[PDB]
Amino acid sequence: YETGCKRCCYLDEYGCIRCC
């Protein structure tokens, strides 16, 4: 996934990706 969480895109493991 990603780290930073901008807005809301998806939920991978902990609940943080490119957005959500």
- 20: burial class by Cβ within 10 Å (0-12, 13-18, 19+)? middle
Q: In 10 A of CB 13, how many CB atoms?
A: 7
In 1-20 the beta strands, taken as DSSP E runs, fall at none
Q: Which residues contact 11 (CB under 8 A, 6 or more apart)?
A: 17, 20
> Could you give the angle at the alpha carbon of 18 between the alpha carbons of 13 and 5, nearest 5°?
80
User: In sequence order, which residues have a C-beta less than 8 Å from that of residue 1 and are 6 or more positions away?
Assistant: 10, 12, 13, 16, 17, 18
Contact between 15 and 1 under an 8 Å Cβ cutoff? The reply is no
Whether residue 2 contacts residue 20, with contact meaning beta carbons closer than 8 Å, is answered with no
